[PDB]
Amino acid sequence: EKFRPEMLQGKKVIVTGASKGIGREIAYHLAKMGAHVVVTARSKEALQKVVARCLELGAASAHYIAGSMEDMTFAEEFVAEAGNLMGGLDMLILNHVLYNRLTFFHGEIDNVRKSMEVNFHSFVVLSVAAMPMLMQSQGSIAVVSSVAGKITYPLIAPYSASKFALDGFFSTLRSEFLVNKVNVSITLCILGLIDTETAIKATSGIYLGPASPKEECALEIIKGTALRQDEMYYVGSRWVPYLLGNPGRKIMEELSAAEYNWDNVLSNEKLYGRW
Amino acid sequence: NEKFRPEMLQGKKVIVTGASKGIGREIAYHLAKMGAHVVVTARSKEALQKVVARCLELGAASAHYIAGSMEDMTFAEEFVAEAGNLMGGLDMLILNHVLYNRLTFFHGEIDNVRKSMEVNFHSFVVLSVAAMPMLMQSQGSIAVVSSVAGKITYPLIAPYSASKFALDGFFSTLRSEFLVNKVNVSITLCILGLIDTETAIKATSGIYLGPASPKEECALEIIKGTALRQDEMYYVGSRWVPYLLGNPGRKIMEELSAAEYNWDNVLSNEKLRW
Amino acid sequence: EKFRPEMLQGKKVIVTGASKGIGREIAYHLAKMGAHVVVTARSKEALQKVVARCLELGAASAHYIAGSMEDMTFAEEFVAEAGNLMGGLDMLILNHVLYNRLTFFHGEIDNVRKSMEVNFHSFVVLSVAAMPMLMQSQGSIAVVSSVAGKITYPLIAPYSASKFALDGFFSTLRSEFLVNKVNVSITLCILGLIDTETAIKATSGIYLGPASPKEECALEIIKGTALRQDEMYYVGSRWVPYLLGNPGRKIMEELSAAEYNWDNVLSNERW
Amino acid sequence: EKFRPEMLQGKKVIVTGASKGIGREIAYHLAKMGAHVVVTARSKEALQKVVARCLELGAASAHYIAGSMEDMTFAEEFVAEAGNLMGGLDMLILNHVLYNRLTFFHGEIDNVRKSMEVNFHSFVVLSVAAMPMLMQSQGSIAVVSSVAGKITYPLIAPYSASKFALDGFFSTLRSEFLVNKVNVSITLCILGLIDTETAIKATSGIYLGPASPKEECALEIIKGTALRQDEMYYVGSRWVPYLLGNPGRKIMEELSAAEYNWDNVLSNEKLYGRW
Numbered sequence A, D: 001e002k003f004r005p006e007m008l009q010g011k012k013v014i015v016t017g018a019s020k021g022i023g024r025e026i027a028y029h030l031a032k033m034g035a036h037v038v039v040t041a042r043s044k045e046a047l048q049k050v051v052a053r054c055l056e057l058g059a060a061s062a063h064y065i066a067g068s069m070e071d072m073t074f075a076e077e078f079v080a081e082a083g084n085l086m087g088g089l090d091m092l093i094l095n096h097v098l099y100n101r102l103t104f105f106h107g108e109i110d111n112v113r114k115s116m117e118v119n120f121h122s123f124v125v126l127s128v129a130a131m132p133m134l135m136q137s138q139g140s141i142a143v144v145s146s147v148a149g150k151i152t153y154p155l156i157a158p159y160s161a162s163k164f165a166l167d168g169f170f171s172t173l174r175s176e177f178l179v180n181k182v183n184v185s186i187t188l189c190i191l192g193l194i195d196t197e198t199a200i201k202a203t204s205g206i207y208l209g210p211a212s213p214k215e216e217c218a219l220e221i222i223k224g225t226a227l228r229q230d231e232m233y234y235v236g237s238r239w240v241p242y243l244l245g246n247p248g249r250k251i252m253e254e255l256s257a258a259e260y261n262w263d264n265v266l267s268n269e270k271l272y273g274r275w
Numbered sequence B: 001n002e003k004f005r006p007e008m009l010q011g012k013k014v015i016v017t018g019a020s021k022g023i024g025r026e027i028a029y030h031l032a033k034m035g036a037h038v039v040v041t042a043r044s045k046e047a048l049q050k051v052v053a054r055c056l057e058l059g060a061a062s063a064h065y066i067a068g069s070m071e072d073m074t075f076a077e078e079f080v081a082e083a084g085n086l087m088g089g090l091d092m093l094i095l096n097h098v099l100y101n102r103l104t105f106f107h108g109e110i111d112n113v114r115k116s117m118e119v120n121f122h123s124f125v126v127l128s129v130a131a132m133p134m135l136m137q138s139q140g141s142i143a144v145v146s147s148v149a150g151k152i153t154y155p156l157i158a159p160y161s162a163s164k165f166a167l168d169g170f171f172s173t174l175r176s177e178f179l180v181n182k183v184n185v186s187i188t189l190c191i192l193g194l195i196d197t198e199t200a201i202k203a204t205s206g207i208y209l210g211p212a213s214p215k216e217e218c219a220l221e222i223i224k225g226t227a228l229r230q231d232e233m234y235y236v237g238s239r240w241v242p243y244l245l246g247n248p249g250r251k252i253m254e255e256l257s258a259a260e261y262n263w264d265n266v267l268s269n270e271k272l273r274w
Numbered sequence C: 001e002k003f004r005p006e007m008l009q010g011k012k013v014i015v016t017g018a019s020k021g022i023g024r025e026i027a028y029h030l031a032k033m034g035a036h037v038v039v040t041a042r043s044k045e046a047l048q049k050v051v052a053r054c055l056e057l058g059a060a061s062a063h064y065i066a067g068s069m070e071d072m073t074f075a076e077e078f079v080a081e082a083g084n085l086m087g088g089l090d091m092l093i094l095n096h097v098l099y100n101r102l103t104f105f106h107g108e109i110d111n112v113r114k115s116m117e118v119n120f121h122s123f124v125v126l127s128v129a130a131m132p133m134l135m136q137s138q139g140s141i142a143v144v145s146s147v148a149g150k151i152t153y154p155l156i157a158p159y160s161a162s163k164f165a166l167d168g169f170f171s172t173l174r175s176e177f178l179v180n181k182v183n184v185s186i187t188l189c190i191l192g193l194i195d196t197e198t199a200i201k202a203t204s205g206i207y208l209g210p211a212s213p214k215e216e217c218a219l220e221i222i223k224g225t226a227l228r229q230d231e232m233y234y235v236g237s238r239w240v241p242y243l244l245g246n247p248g249r250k251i252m253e254e255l256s257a258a259e260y261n262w263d264n265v266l267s268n269e270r271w
């Protein structure tokens, strides 16, 4: 079941946080594959450059919409406008993340709140807004997370909380989609240190581990999502993913599914509605 | 290392949130039997009053209640101060309250996700920040009450699970920092299986066939594990399940990645609090 | 002597650099207190969002004027238009700034010039333009500065020069206003690391110390100015302000005032 | 480390604002010590007289270049021509200042701009232009400032702003030079009322303070700079310097140096470059 760049030709993709870093590279790859893209971020000028580059690169079409993901109204309206621009949606790539730095936690409650809004709540709002289109196209969602969304590291409590939250929410959603045979795939991407300008500045002489290249990172995210994988690990080691992937949890989730009165659940109107 | 004794809590100054019913109420009762000072909180005044009265009969050193919603961050903050005044300090902060939502498939209830994150997560953080000075002075402890659904995922409770995962991310990171900085406030994450509280029994009814553990013993185990300053406390109705939940891989990784830090540029830059 | 939010209800306030960071939060607080506000910065769309929010927050009125403070003609014209919009001016909050990712100095004269224009000269131009209105209302000026405006830090020479300049100028002006019994207060605000997106990005990986919250910072600036304080320290420590506040200088300034021949002076020499 | 006039024999020194007052006296002292000097100011005839006196006094060599420090192109070109004249540069004495008049501030924006250009920006331009030569010779810079550059006085806002600015800039530069082990010394000279014709006229019936002699002032500037001191106080009291010198600031600056990630900084890669 091998990946081929043709899996994305003509596809309608949204990439958030695409004015720089991994997101920008994700846009570029998609353009090379002849996909339709709508990129978003806060910076208009940066987004404009990305759109121009994507067109040169061979994108089927490329547009940008500028706004902050701290604003939930924008997140919601963005998905509608984007769907109009492309006439639908095959893939939703959730990549953006709030500015953060490395510091011991001292009581930055506002930082905790803002991180949860931008890194987490907006991912949920965007997904909800996109779900009708995704269900129609039987499309996919990439949820971009971090090694710090699977284990804990000093110096990034607010960030880690929001990335853990993503795992809890979207992993639960995936399980439901499976039980209800909804054919929208949800891929959780777990990234190690990636050599984006932002990550390198935040960590240079503090965290000493090696960084992985952003170009290959972005491609691996695209592949894993296209192939509809549950999780995609890009952490700079072929072994580390298994220490992160928690065999115990996968076993437990598989076994606990048998504890449900499915006879009832799948035939209970009150547990269902729609979007 | 050592064995728990009820005397570890005699005279101690403890806060129990979500203590008008269920596990929290039982936690209050145990603490009273051990002769601790308690301040219980929840939204229901009358229910809290009953709990305080019982705690006193039970042998609490002192018992008071403060009523309010944990969806209000100003209250959470002010509550900890008033509670500290009532007892003249704080040894143990037991974070127990929660917002439940009907077992139901998710389909766009964003407001439920937001409210769950406020009540189950953000307030836990606000309370902890407000209590930290007192806890540092007493070298006290925090119990963070969570769930099996905070370690693995279950259909039908996405909003709840997100908030409980968040707790693990945040408080586990905080603990690691406290260790690196030799701050002697312990943080105990409690992972509970199905417990036979009225609320949990009604909610899973005819949906989840799994077993329930007794609330009285659950509450005691939370108190013990926190008193003994354990990192985590599993009460899940099986002696084996905790190891399938406890993720040996993660513990190894966290231990090893600590060596990747330039601690001389981190700890030596530590010349600054709450 | 205690601050009350009512001190700002109906007041006519200008906030510069108010499209994000501390300035935006200053606008929001003022709106909650029912003040009239005119916000300014370069970004039109950002300013529009701020104005809309302020109105929802309970501002008596809110308008925006977009332009660069590197242009002195704009700075001057902005104050007039703003005064027209509100029919006067009670408080001028000078907050805007040019930041430079931290770097050792190595000959960037143009950076030194542009920093002095934006962080310093425009503060002066704006104050001069606003002075008639402020004298009429016996209003106040908040001059937003920095710990780097009181002591020196590696890596920010251009910024520090301009912030020191502000202290020199506005502190001298305050002393003159006192000698001449002009009742316009001048409050110099000295800020430590504040958790704005811009400050966090600029020092990330370089400084790992605690930043202070921007919401409380903005409120403290408003309070200190409303109470007409000479200086307002918000630096993340209750002790540090006294190591920055230079008791020696305050003593010297108090004593040297007696060295002046107030006869040949006060007898002699507007905007 | 006692000063000796021989520390300046054969040295290559620039003195700005040297057609009268303190600067002229600085030139004279340097000549007596057998240094090479290049003097500058706007007045040709006055500079010519100074050069002649310097030669008569025993200067190794003496030249003058006339021009205004309001013109940044001149400031830059002056340092090059001066370096050519002497074949290098050991000491840069920044002394010039715009004429100012004691008066309450009444919205004289043009005065503020011109004072900042002449008293501050030109000091920076000159320093930048001279830095290569100074680094080669491991030389020194004297930044001539004022008590009004450390505390504030009614009636001189424009002047004080520019002198404060000097402290901010050159004190920051010094700290950087120390961190990077660049061996060019920067001496900030803090002067009280000095009996130059200009200062006496300006303050005649206003400041009733006691003036210090200009000849000794100029010598103290030379000594302090030769001995590579951080600051040099000549204020007419042995006690006043400590009320101006701000112990609190020195402590803070010493302590805050420990808050930096030098391994990031010293190795942020691109925090350097050159002149």
Ligand SMILES: NC(=O)c1ccc[n+]([C@@H]2O[C@H](COP(=O)([O-])OP(=O)(O)OC[C@H]3O[C@@H](n4cnc5c(N)ncnc54)[C@H](OP(=O)(O)O)[C@@H]3O)[C@@H](O)[C@H]2O)c1
Binding pocket: A016, A017, A018, A019, A020, A021, A022, A023, A040, A041, A042, A043, A046, A067, A068, A069, A070, A095, A096, A097, A098, A099, A118, A144, A145, A146, A147, A191, A192, A193, A194, A195, A196, A197, A198, A199
């Ligand atoms: N880099 C790593 O080592 C690493 C490691 C683990 C996980 N990750 C994950 O990878 C993803 C991308 O990381 P990165 O290093 O590529 O990020 P980045 O370079 O720092 O930029 C992320 C993008 O998010 C956007 N963004 C920030 N705030 C926003 C807001 N409020 N509203 C809308 N967009 C906003 C930014 O655009 P604007 O500023 O213009 O708004 C930017 O385009 C993140 O989810 C991160 O957690 C990265």
Ligand SMILES: NC(=O)c1ccc[n+]([C@@H]2O[C@H](COP(=O)([O-])OP(=O)(O)OC[C@H]3O[C@@H](n4cnc5c(N)ncnc54)[C@H](OP(=O)(O)O)[C@@H]3O)[C@@H](O)[C@H]2O)c1
Binding pocket: B017, B018, B019, B020, B021, B022, B023, B024, B041, B042, B043, B044, B047, B068, B069, B070, B071, B095, B096, B097, B098, B099, B100, B119, B145, B146, B147, B148, B192, B193, B194, B195, B196, B197, B198, B199, B200
């Ligand atoms: N029961 C289980 O099977 C189980 C399993 C895993 C984890 N847990 C954890 O155990 C803890 C207690 O569970 P439980 O079953 O004992 O809970 P419960 O019986 O449903 O009641 C929890 C308490 O929280 C309080 N509360 C709810 N909303 C509040 C608000 N907005 N502000 C302040 N207090 C509020 C309630 O008081 P008021 O309504 O009067 O405000 C109540 O006293 C929770 O953290 C839960 O996540 C339980």
Ligand SMILES: NC(=O)c1ccc[n+]([C@@H]2O[C@H](COP(=O)([O-])OP(=O)(O)OC[C@H]3O[C@@H](n4cnc5c(N)ncnc54)[C@H](OP(=O)(O)O)[C@@H]3O)[C@@H](O)[C@H]2O)c1
Binding pocket: C016, C017, C018, C019, C020, C021, C022, C023, C040, C041, C042, C043, C046, C067, C068, C069, C070, C094, C095, C096, C097, C098, C099, C118, C144, C145, C146, C147, C191, C192, C193, C194, C195, C196, C197, C198, C199
């Ligand atoms: N943040 C800190 O840790 C800290 C510490 C000490 C002092 N301070 C002081 O606090 C004040 C605000 O800092 P901040 O971090 O909130 O700033 P910020 O987030 O970086 O933004 C400052 C504001 O100034 C505006 N601005 C920039 N260039 C301008 C120009 N040429 N003309 C007009 N407006 C311009 C910006 O709007 P546009 O870009 O849209 O023009 C922005 O709204 C500054 O005076 C700063 O020196 C902050």
Ligand SMILES: NC(=O)c1ccc[n+]([C@@H]2O[C@H](COP(=O)([O-])OP(=O)(O)OC[C@H]3O[C@@H](n4cnc5c(N)ncnc54)[C@H](OP(=O)(O)O)[C@@H]3O)[C@@H](O)[C@H]2O)c1
Binding pocket: D016, D017, D018, D019, D020, D021, D022, D023, D040, D041, D042, D043, D046, D067, D068, D069, D070, D095, D096, D097, D098, D099, D118, D144, D145, D146, D147, D191, D192, D193, D194, D195, D196, D197, D198, D199
């Ligand atoms: N005198 C005091 O009581 C006192 C107190 C504190 C600090 N200081 C500092 O001591 C230094 C010298 O003071 P001073 O009293 O000796 O000064 P001064 O007698 O008034 O003359 C200063 C020199 O600067 C030159 N100058 C003025 N404008 C210039 C321009 N646009 N371009 C180039 N050169 C210019 C003048 O020459 P031209 O006019 O021919 O150009 C003159 O040679 C100044 O930095 C001053 O701030 C003096």
